């Protein structure tokens, strides 16, 4: 059965990666929040 | 953005009150208009998005003065 | 023209292994560990100056670091660049 | 400003080797000294083929707290406390009892 997650690296990056996040204000905010939290992996970026 | 260039009139929020006093948020836009103003000193038309009040002000003072004021404020025309 | 200083920095070590040995013996090709940033030409230059030996050609590759586990904690070894440097016929290297 | 040092003869104030004496062998950063012949332990040394160690019950010198030893003044025939003072633009230790400089 075709399950929901069907990985594709480029797609992932474009969607969720650092640059995408940077591009918008909300993305930036998210990043900031993550930083505040103390996340080790700030984004999906490898 | 709906802003009189002479006066600085922006939109302001407010309410529609009904007969049953049902407040609902609304705006009050200014009565803006893009108008070519003849500038006698420079001998050219300067277009300005201005309120009717702005126009009145201009009439009162002189366009030149208004222009000067605008310049002082750091506003292009 | 590569700078002397740069050249010295390029070459990290000789690589000892069965394959390397074979290369040395049969094909007249030395297997070096080099700086990860070191390009082929630079490597060649280094070889020529620092070992005093004519170079035919340099093949490089990047070796990826193995992931290991020291007790409970996970940790990755560093990547490093390997270079097969083929010396010209009759060139004997100390 | 460390009152006990490498080559000082000291006397032990407390423990199993209390009253005994011995030259400080070396002093550790942890605030402990190892004194010659004082605090002894019979370690069971595990043999290793490399490094030429046979492995046996080796009696070695364990550390002792610096607080537990005291610098011995040979003149008084007793343990003393150490003070610090400047003689000829140079800091030196002295025995509190009798006020003489440590040399």
């Amino acid at each position: 059965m075709k399950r929901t997650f069907q990985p594709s690296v480029l797609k992932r990056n474009r969607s969720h990666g650092f640059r995408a996040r940077m591009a918008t204000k909300n993305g930036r905010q998210v990043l900031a929040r993550r930083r505040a939290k103390g996340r080790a992996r700030l984004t999906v970026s490898k | 953005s709906r802003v009189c260039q002479v006066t600085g009139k922006r939109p302001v929020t407010g309410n529609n009150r009904s007969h049953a006093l049902n407040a609902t948020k609304r705006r009050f836009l200014p009565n803006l208009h893009s108008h070519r103003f003849w500038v006698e000193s420079e001998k050219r038309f300067v277009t300005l998005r201005v309120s009717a009040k702005g126009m009145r002000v201009i009439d009162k003072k002189g366009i030149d003065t208004v222009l000067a004021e605008l310049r002082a404020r750091g506003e292009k025309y | 023209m590569i700078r002397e200083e740069r050249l010295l920095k390029v070459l990290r070590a000789p690589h000892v292994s069965e394959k390397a040995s074979t290369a040395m013996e049969k094909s007249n090709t030395i297997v070096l560990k080099v700086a990860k940033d070191a390009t082929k030409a630079e490597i060649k230059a280094a070889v020529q100056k620092l070992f005093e030996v004519e170079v035919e050609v340099v093949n490089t590759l990047v070796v990826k670091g193995k992931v290991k586990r020291h007790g409970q904690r996970i940790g990755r070894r560093s990547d490093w660049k390997k270079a097969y440097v083929t010396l010209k016929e009759g060139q004997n290297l100390d | 400003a460390a009152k006990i040092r490498r080559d000082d003869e000291v006397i032990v104030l407390t423990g199993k080797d209390k009253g005994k004496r011995g030259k400080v062998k070396n002093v550790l950063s942890s605030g402990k000294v190892i004194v010659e012949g004082i605090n002894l332990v019979k370690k069971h040394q595990k043999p290793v083929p490399a490094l030429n160690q046979p492995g046996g019950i080796v009696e070695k010198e364990a550390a002792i707290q610096v607080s537990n030893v005291a610098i011995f003044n040979a003149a008084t025939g007793k343990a003393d406390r150490v003070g610090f003072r400047f003689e000829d633009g140079k800091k030196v230790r002295f025995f509190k009892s009798n006020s003489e400089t440590i040399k």
């Binding site: - | - | 002397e4 200083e5 010295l8 070590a13 560990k33 | -």
Partner: protein
């Protein structure tokens, strides 16, 4: 060694630095093999190099 190396020219310094670098390289070469049984040497050499660099910087625009 810095007080001794301070009393030198730029050219002189450069040559010295080069020599040091060479030495370091040699050590590295040896180290990789089973030749070098004096590890501290490497540490020393790097330090020396650093010192030389510092001196050079001091000389040229400081």
């Amino acid at each position: 060694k810095a007080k001794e190396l301070r009393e030198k020219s730029v050219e002189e310094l450069n040559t010295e630095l080069l020599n040091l670098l060479r030495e370091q390289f040699n050590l590295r070469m040896q180290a990789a093999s089973g030749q070098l049984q004096q590890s501290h040497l490497l540490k020393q050499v790097r330090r020396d190099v650093a010192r030389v660099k510092t001196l050079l910087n001091e000389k040229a625009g400081a």
